[PDB]
């Protein structure tokens, strides 16, 4: 749905980072180039971020 | 009709008078606690406030109940209802203050349960008198049923949602005879097999041979540790095995003092060698098998599946025997203890890497397959030359197929003994088949080297299509991967061809235990309701209901089925 | 072997071959109590009244059905509570 | 007028069969939901070959 | 080559394509043992995920939706055509295979519960019941209003303050569990009035109120209660390779043991339990899910692709500076010292099973008898005592202690106390009052004695009376 | 099925429970008093 | 499902390519349910004139 | 109550006589009205 | 004593009277050996059947019906 | 009381015990306003 | 409650002592000391100091039950000396170690505040 | 009987991460102190939540849950803020809890995404840390979100949200001379990054006596507490402990006396 506020092994915000990458996707950088611009040396922050899927787009488009 | 109003399965006079639910009954699910003893049984709060036990009012005790009346349907322990000596019932809640009521003499209290009493524990199905064993309440905040691992082996019920069903005695009698004749401790040996039901764990069992390698050595601060942990240490530390470099204690010195008292037991290795037996060193042992235990003290072997298994003459057998049941308990609940400590800094993994084995040992295997293949070769063009004679009373195409599957038999053998010789102490998985706990040889082969021949019904897969197990195969095609021998093991992967033949076996497999399942349990429930009625009289004559002897003696011994054990004569079998 | 040996005793104590059958436990020396509990009540009953039959009792089920104890282990014996044994007894508050 | 007959959902006579997603979100329907079940007193039933 | 023949007819287009979408989502199926396979195809199924993208436009009972749900590490090409990523029912959870204090032994997996409080495993549970007026008569009619103690013959102890003037309580108010959330009266010839209670301890907040004429044309109402539960120890968890157990236990990111990095795995699992399923698939795919975090790239777990090799994806890790292996140096948490033993640790998509410990444990004391055999029966708290097993009787009978068989069989159930003369056997009137009771027929005071029975017994011998078959009790 | 034919297994225990007048394969186990036991060509 | 006959139960070489293995529900009868393979395709038929 | 509890040694089987079901049935001159009650 | 009974006490015997002595002493039964301390019945009727000061007897009923009459200290505890 | 007609985005009393329509809109589908009252939640 | 409130098991109940004394006559002198309501982390740190030291014989700190919240802790000393000194010697010992290693950390970041350049 | 004197050496000092070595101490010491810094040392964030209307897709439990773990400063007032159990003012009040209050509303065609930085505190001390701003949530066009909420000071203990810093790395001996851990092929293993090793030894060799020292430490924080000021923190909480556990056992003895 959206991306968590804090990863689930270390607790350091990656909601914020979210957005980031998602410019990092729409600028030349692939998904793993986006994790290594982020920097983070830890599996589970990347993991995050690539297994992150965003259904809220979905939820939007049906009308209130 | 007055006829049809009576009525048999789901009827007044058969269904619900034979058996009828039970008040003080709890259900949950139940989750496996190492820390909790084998008598306790972990109760969740809301279901120990939920059941109660009614109590008579006794002076001693009178200040403990008037605390129980003042708190009412509010505090965990609390009396939900007061009978009083006329017999009506009050209830707290409803009253407008408890204070104003006051107990009497032989009022009955309903006090919710606590921790210490006495509830009879049995699994939904209960096929023998070892799935009913009787527990003591043990309270835990979370809502599940906590039991210890070494009860869990005659239950025999694996943690993924399985359920277990405890009832409260509400009669003083009746939980007396409960507490003589179905306590846990008491029930840990069988009268069926002579021997316990209950066996070590396997993860337990495996960190045991671990711990009972002859290559162990504990720091002065570890053995502190695991010597508070032990409920048998006496508060005195045992001299160091080891002591000019520092203070050392080996983990079978370790075992040593977990052990009971001075129980002498001798158990022969899983993997002990009759050849070491007969051949000089015997009482060396050089590879450490021949375990033996004297004066409570494990002395030289390692700890394997049979020593601690389920089984006669098994160390934990030789403790019940000897130090009686209760000890044993603590017997077990001790070694879960220590052998847990041990186990986290000693660690216990498995990888990919101990199921891959060097590429030296994958060539030899596939060398054996590929001559088996060229054997076939041969027997299928001589068959068809006729060559071949069919040995008498069996067909010729029966003695054809047997003799091409003797070929497949022979290299998977040869290619299991290339999986074993890749294995190494250092290797996880050859750890795991070494104690038995869980794993075997013949998976290892399967997992390294050939996962075996593939049939249906004992017999290889028969053609579907007309002369051809599959399109992909030709007409008459009697090649083994037709016939659905697999040569290519787990890691390796399956071939599609393959992997449809597995799944045939497979789908067989899961049908036949399905099926058996039903049928042993329809035939035990005629059994169970045609010799319930037997039974031994004060006499001792075994009898009917209908009192006509079943036999003069029960057995023919008159003794009972778990006292007698095997024993050697000694004079038959020696030359006059 | 006891267990073994107990159910191939009670099979042939008949002496003739009996499978264990509903038809098998129909014919025996039972009373009509278990009879009823096997589902053949209507004619076992009507069979015994006719007959001024009595129900033994020997069966575990039929005082279980009564409510009263089976005569199984802790049931067959009576206590006798004795007096002079109670004498050297001491009271308690 | 012969009688009702239940219409299978995304069948070429049910209304969702040819509309656009648009037209589906508008009507609260999941373009992803895959159809093919009778609606039966407000309950999903779908035969079983 | 030596082909089996040069002229084929047809071509399979993929050897994959065979296997079904149950089957798709299991990574490496082939290498995995083929019954774990179909138990997995079961679990696909119960597994927890939200059912549809506009799941608050129909309102289901016992509805399942994922708090985070997260796309699979290795993904099959086939998972793709079914649209599993799309609405994906499982997290990823990083996995150890480790022992140790034992709660993992017999399927047991070790959770952390720094995770639990981050959402990681959370779901959402929606529950609908729905009521309609019922007109079966014009003075049966059965309008919805707020029932009141005066108004109401039946009205209940548990308060209606909850409900509306409509009788039908606000959305967004949270109700607590066996509380009425429906007040319909029904008019009587005051009025009786009929009330739907909440499932006990259902702790919703009610998602929304919906009141819409029926097909029939009767007022028709709807509510939806929204309940939010966090991962628990009775919960169970399922692994994709055909692994299912229940949560040992949860500790903290500190209890929890941890690596040179300082990564704590979310799930531990018991080593014994590989080996015994021989899932050599999941190994590879644990090995697989950290060389794609690292790659960047998301794994394929095609069966018969054979696009990546247990050497392969070793090398790649090679490559990243991870030890080839995947096993890793590890700390125990409370020890601080480093472990003998290095655990391979590797990622693990993992789905949360149906089944919850919550409903499952039930418990009841003292609940109410049905009329006719006086057998015990379900309250409002929907709590029943469990049925003593035919089996069961026969192992107490093994046992030997008769008397708590008889409790259970008499004392526990329809317990009776009947009158009845030596000759007569007739069920005698019993009078309270005057303490005296008298076999008619042979007017004997003397005569009577008490016995206990069960009260189906009493009945089932009244019953035989009536057939004209006579059951006689005498005392001698 | 893994032994000719012979009845074993939980369906033999139900023959025993339930006596038959043919077993599913009935089949004798015959020994020979006279030497032709001894030797292949007598017997 | 009651019935234990192994022939229907039993898994077959021409099931290749038209019904999943793996996909079977367990229980009390075993493979008596299967599901269709993606690949295959139920027949709408034409008519033979 | 004031009775005795005792348990049955014996239970017999026999055809209840109609004279004695009189004796002991609580209605007197038998049930006359079909209906259950009449208002 | 000529009596093909056991003079050892059975172990169901053993059961009931114990449980009997507990369901004695929670009702304030006159003990004949002081309790230790102990709130448990159970745990006191267990060190009376030890001090044999029971006052049980109990009767056996053979199958031709002769009854032989054992007291607590007669009979030797089973355990 | 009030109700809340899906199909326009308007709310419309509801008269009781009278047949459930919109007005201008036909709708016999209603949805009842939120609560009045605030209910507390934990962060945790 | 199913589920046990987090600020309970950091905090001991007004009933509750924190630190209790349990005499062992196993061995001569020595003493138990059981912390309840106490994490894993205060237990390890101290039952180091107390091997540490060569008047205590014998160290052991052990955890009845994870779900429980509690410390046993095991000291043995010799007869002359006390078991209750030697764990307060203990806790002083730790205190000690931590403030001067804290003046050490502020004097560490107050030398290099930018850095070493 | 005497405690060693430790020694302190920081490798780096940043606000993402600080890597500090201490030597002459012991292993014990070593691990409670990181164990300290992870759950020991508190923080303020939001524990109570009150949603006065949710138009939003997500639900108002939902919302509540991210709030809270979403981070506040709490530099210099974690000390200044009192529990609000322990305070006896009023369990909603400036001194012993931070008020947050956001009011979103979106007329835009466009989808209107609510921020942390959205949030307005009572008390500036207490803010997001927004310097990207975290996304709560996205509101479609019509929709209003208010909610009222309260942020309590608690440590890593209470909550994982609570807790103030990210995974601690904690690594000691990467030369195996202690021989704590045995690998069955050294060469195979990739050498430390601390490890002295040369690329020629694969593994060290084994020391009779061994004492562990020179553990390495990196605590990485959110930035709402500097991480050096935690480890300051952390070294008087964990000496509070024994000091409190001192008093206590001094109160035991003279009761006994
Ligand atoms: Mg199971
Ligand atoms: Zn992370
Ligand atoms: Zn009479
Ligand atoms: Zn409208
Ligand atoms: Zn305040």
Redesign the pocket.
């Known amino acids: 749905m959206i991306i968590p506020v804090r990863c689930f092994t270390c607790g350091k915000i990656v909601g914020n980072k979210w957005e980031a990458y998602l410019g990092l996707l729409q600028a030349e950088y692939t998904e793993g180039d986006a994790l290594d611009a982020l920097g983070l040396k830890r599996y589970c922050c990347r993991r995050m971020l690539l297994a992150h899927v965003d259904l809220i787009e979905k939820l939007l488009n049906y009308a209130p | 009709s007055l006829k049809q109003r009576l009525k048999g399965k789901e009827g007044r006079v058969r269904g619900n008078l034979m058996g009828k639910r039970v008040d003080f009954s709890a259900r949950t699910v139940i989750t496996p606690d190492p820390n909790l003893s084998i008598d306790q049984v972990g109760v969740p709060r809301s279901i120990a406030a939920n059941m109660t036990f009614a109590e008579i009012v006794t002076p001693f005790n009178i200040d403990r109940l008037q605390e129980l009346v003042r708190r009412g349907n509010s505090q965990y322990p609390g009396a939900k209802y007061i009978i009083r000596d006329n017999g009506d019932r009050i209830d707290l809640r409803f009253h407008p203050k408890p204070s104003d009521l006051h107990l009497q003499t032989g009022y009955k209290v309903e006090r919710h349960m606590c921790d210490g009493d006495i509830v009879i524990f049995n699994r939904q199905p209960t096929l023998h008198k070892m799935s009913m064993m009787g527990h003591r309440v043990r309270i835990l905040p979370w809502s599940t049923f906590r039991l210890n691992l070494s009860v869990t082996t005659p239950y025999n019920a694996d943690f993924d949602g399985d359920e277990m069903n405890l009832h409260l005695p509400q009669s003083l009698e009746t939980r007396a005879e409960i507490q003589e004749l179905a306590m846990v401790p008491r029930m840990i040996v069988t009268p069926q097999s002579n021997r316990p039901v209950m066996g070590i764990v396997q993860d337990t069992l495996t960190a045991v041979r671990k711990f009972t390698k002859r290559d162990v050595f504990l720091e002065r601060g570890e053995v502190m540790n695991l010597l508070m942990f032990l409920s048998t240490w006496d508060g005195k530390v045992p001299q160091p095995a080891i002591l000019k470099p520092r203070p050392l204690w080996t983990g079978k010195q370790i075992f040593s003092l977990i052990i009971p008292g001075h129980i002498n037991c001798i158990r022969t290795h899983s993997t002990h060698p009759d050849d070491e037996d007969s051949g000089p060193y015997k009482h060396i042992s050089p590879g450490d098998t021949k375990v033996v235990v004297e004066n409570g003290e494990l002395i030289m072997g390692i700890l394997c599946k049979k020593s601690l298994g389920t089984s006669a003459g098994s160390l934990v057998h030789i403790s019940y025997l000897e130090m009686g049941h209760d000890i044993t308990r603590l017997f077990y609940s001790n070694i879960q203890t220590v052998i847990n400590n041990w186990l986290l800094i000693e660690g216990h993994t498995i990888g990919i890497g101990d199921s891959i084995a060097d590429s030296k040992t994958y060539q030899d295997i596939q060398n054996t397959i590929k001559k088996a293949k060229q054997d076939v070769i041969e027997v299928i063009e001589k068959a068809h030359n006729n060559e071949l004679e069919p040995t008498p009373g069996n067909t010729l195409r029966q003695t054809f197929e047997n003799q091409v599957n003797r070929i497949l038999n022979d290299a998977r053998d040869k290619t299991g003994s290339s999986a074993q010789k890749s294995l190494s102490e250092y290797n996880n998985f050859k750890s795991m088949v070494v104690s038995g706990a869980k794993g075997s040889k013949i998976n290892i082969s399967q997992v390294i080297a050939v996962v075996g021949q593939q049939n249906v019904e004992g017999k290889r897969i028969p053609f579907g299509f007309k002369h051809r197990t599959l399109p992909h195969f030709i007409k008459d095609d009697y090649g083994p991967e037709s016939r659905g021998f697999v040569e290519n093991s787990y890691l390796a992967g399956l071939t599609p061809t393959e992997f449809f033949f597995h799944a045939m076996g497979g789908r067989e497999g899961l049908i036949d235990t399905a099926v058996k399942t039903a049928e042993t349990g329809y035939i035990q429930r005629r059994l169970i309701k045609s010799m319930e009625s037997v039974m031994v009289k004060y006499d001792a004559t075994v009898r009917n209901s209908i009192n006509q002897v079943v036999q003069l003696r029960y057995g023919e011994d008159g003794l009972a089925g778990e006292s007698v054990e095997f024993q050697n004569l000694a004079t038959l079998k020696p030359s006059n | 072997y006891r267990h073994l040996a107990l159910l191939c005793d009670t099979m042939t104590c008949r002496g003739h071959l009996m499978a264990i059958t509903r038809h098998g436990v129909n014919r025996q020396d039972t009373g009509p109590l278990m009879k009823c509990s096997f589902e053949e009540t209507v004619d076992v009953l009507m069979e015994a009244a006719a007959h001024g039959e009595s129900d033994p009792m020997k069966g575990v089920s039929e005082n279980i059905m009564l409510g009263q104890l089976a005569p199984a282990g802790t049931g067959c014996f009576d206590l006798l509570l004795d007096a002079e044994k109670c004498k050297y007894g001491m009271e308690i508050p | 007028f012969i009688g009702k007959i239940p219409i299978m959902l995304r069948s070429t006579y049910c209304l969702l069969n040819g509309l656009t997603d648009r037209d589906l979100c508008e009507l609260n329907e999941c373009p992803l939901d895959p159809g093919g079940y009778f609606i039966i007193n407000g309950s999903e039933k779908v035969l079983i070959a | 080559e030596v082909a089996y023949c040069s002229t084929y007819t047809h071509c399979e287009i993929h050897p994959s394509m065979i296997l079904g979408v149950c089957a798709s989502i299991i990574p490496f199926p082939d290498h995995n043992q083929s019954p774990r396979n179909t138990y997995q195809s079961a679990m696909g199924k119960q597994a927890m995920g939200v059912y549809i993208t506009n799941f608050h436009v129909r309102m289901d009972t016992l509805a399942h939706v994922l708090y985070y749900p997260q796309k699979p590490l290795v993904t099959t090409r086939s998972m793709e055509y079914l649209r599993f990523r799309e609405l994906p029912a499982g997290i990823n959870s990083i996995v150890a295979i480790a022992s140790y204090t034992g709660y993992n032994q017999e399927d047991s997996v070790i959770m952390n519960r720094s995770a639990v409080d981050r959402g990681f495993f959370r779901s959402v549970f929606y529950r609908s019941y729905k009521e309609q007026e019922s007109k079966k008569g014009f003075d049966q009619e059965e309008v919805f209003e707020k029932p009141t103690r005066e108004t109401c013959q039946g009205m209940r102890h548990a308060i209606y303050d909850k409900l509306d003037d409509d009788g039908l309580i606000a959305p967004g108010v949270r109700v607590s569990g066996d509380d009425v959330i429906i007040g319909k009266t029904v008019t009587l010839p005051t009025k009786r009035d009929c009330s739907t209670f909440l499932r006990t301890s259902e702790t919703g907040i009610v998602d929304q109120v919906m009141v819409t004429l029926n097909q029939e044309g009767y007022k028709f109402c709807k509510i939806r209660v929204r309940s939010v539960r966090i991962p628990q120890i009775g919960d169970k968890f399922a692994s994709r390779h055909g692994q299912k157990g229940t949560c040992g236990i949860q500790y903290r990111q500190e209890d929890m043991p941890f690596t040179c990095e300082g990564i704590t795995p979310d799930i531990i699992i018991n080593p014994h339990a590989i080996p015994s399923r021989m899932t050599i698939g999941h190994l590879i795919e644990c090995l697989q899910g950290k060389v794609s975090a690292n790659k960047g790239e998301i794994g394929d777990a095609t069966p018969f692709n054979d696009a990546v090799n247990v050497q392969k994806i070793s090398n790649l890790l090679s490559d990243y500076g991870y030890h080839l292996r995947g096993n890793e140096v590890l700390y125990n948490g409370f020890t601080g010292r480093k472990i003998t033993s290095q655990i391979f640790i590797g990622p693990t998509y993992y789905q949360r099973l149906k089944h919850m410990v919550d409903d499952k444990i039930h418990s009841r004391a003292r609940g109410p008898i049905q009329i006719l055999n006086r057998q015990p029966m379900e309250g409002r708290s929907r709590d029943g005592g469990l049925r003593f097993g035919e089996m069961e009787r026969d192992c107490q009978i093994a046992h030997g202690a008769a008397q708590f068989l008889r409790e259970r069989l008499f004392e526990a159930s329809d317990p009776y106390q009947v009158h009845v003369c030596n000759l007569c056997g007739i069920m005698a009137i019993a009078n309270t009052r005057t303490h005296t009771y008298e076999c008619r027929g042979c007017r004997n005071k003397t005569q009577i004695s008490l016995v206990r029975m069960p009260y189906a017994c009493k009945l089932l011998f009244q019953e035989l009376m009536s057939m004209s078959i006579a059951p006689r009790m005498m005392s001698v | 099925f893994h032994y000719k034919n012979v009845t074993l297994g939980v369906p033999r225990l139900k023959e025993l429970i339930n006596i038959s007048k043919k077993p599913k394969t009935p089949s004798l186990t015959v020994f020979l008093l006279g030497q032709s036991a001894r030797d292949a060509e007598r017997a | 499902r009651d019935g234990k006959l192994a022939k229907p139960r039993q898994l077959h070489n021409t099931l290749w390519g038209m019904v999943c293995p793996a996909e079977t529900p367990e229980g009390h009868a075993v493979g008596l349910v299967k599901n269709l393979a993606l690949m295959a395709y139920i027949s709408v038929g034409s008519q033979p004139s | 109550s004031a009775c005795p509890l005792r348990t049955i040694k014996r239970v017999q089987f026999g055809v209840l006589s109609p004279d004695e079901l009189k004796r002991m049935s609580v209605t007197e001159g038998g049930i006359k009205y079909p209906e259950t009650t009449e208002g | 004593q000529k009596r093909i009974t056991t003079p050892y006490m059975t172990k169901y015997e053993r059961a009931r009277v114990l449980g009997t002595r507990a369901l004695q002493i929670a009702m304030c039964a006159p003990v004949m050996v002081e309790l230790e301390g102990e709130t448990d019945p159970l745990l006191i009727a267990m060190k009376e059947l030890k001090a044999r000061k029971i006052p049980i007897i109990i009767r056996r009923y053979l199958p031709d019906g002769s009854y032989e009459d054992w007291g607590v200290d007669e009979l030797i505890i089973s355990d | 009381m009030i109700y809340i007609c899906g199909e326009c985005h308007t709310e419309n009393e509801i008269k009781s015990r009278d047949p459930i329509r919109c007005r201008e809109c036909g709708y016999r589908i209603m949805y009842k306003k939120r609560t009045k009252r605030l209910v507390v939640f934990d962060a945790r | 409650m199913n589920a046990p409130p987090a600020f309970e098991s950091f905090l001991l109940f007004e009933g509750e002592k924190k630190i209790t004394i349990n005499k062992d006559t196993k061995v001569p002198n020595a003493c138990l000391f059981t912390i309840n309501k106490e994490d894993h982390t205060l237990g390890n740190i101290i039952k180091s100091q107390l091997l540490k030291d060569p008047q205590v014989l014998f160290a052991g700190y052990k955890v009845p039950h994870p779900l429980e919240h509690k410390i046993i802790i095991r000291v043995q000393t010799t007869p002359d000396y006390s078991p209750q000194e030697a764990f307060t010697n203990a806790i002083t010992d730790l205190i000690s170690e931590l403030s001067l290693l804290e003046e050490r950390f502020r004097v560490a970041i107050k030398d290099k505040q930018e850095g070493i350049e | 009987p005497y405690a060693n004197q430790p020694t302190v050496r920081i490798t780096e000092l940043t606000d993402e991460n600080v890597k500090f070595i201490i030597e002459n101490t012991d292993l014990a010491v070593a691990n409670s102190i990181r164990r300290v810094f992870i759950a020991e040392v508190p923080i303020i964030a939001i524990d109570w939540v009150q949603i006065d209307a949710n138009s939003s897709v997500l639900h108002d439990e939902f919302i509540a849950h991210r709030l809270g773990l979403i981070p506040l400063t709490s530099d210099d007032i974690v000390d200044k803020l009192?529990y609000?159990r322990d305070?006896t003012?009023?369990?909603?009040?400036?001194?012993?809890?931070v008020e947050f209050t956001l009011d979103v509303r979106c007329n835009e065609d466009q989808t209107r995404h609510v921020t942390s930085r959205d949030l307005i505190s009572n008390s500036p001390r207490v803010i997001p840390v927004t310097s990207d701003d975290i996304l709560i949530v996205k509101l479609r066009k019509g929709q209003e979100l208010r909610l009222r909420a309260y942020a309590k000071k608690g440590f890593g203990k209470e909550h994982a949200k609570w807790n103030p810093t990210a995974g601690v790395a904690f690594e000691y001996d990467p030369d195996n001379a202690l021989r704590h851990t045995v690998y069955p092929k050294p060469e195979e293993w990739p050498k430390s990054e601390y490890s002295e090793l040369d690329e020629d030894e694969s593994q060290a060799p084994y020391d009779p006596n061994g004492k562990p020292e020179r553990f390495y430490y990196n605590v990485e924080s959110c930035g709402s507490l500097r991480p050096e000021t935690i480890v300051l923190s952390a070294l008087s909480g964990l000496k509070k402990k024994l000091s409190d556990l001192q008093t206590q056992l001094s109160h035991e003895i003279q009761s006994d006396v």
């Open positions: 009192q609000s305070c003012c009023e369990e909603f009040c400036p001194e012993c809890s």
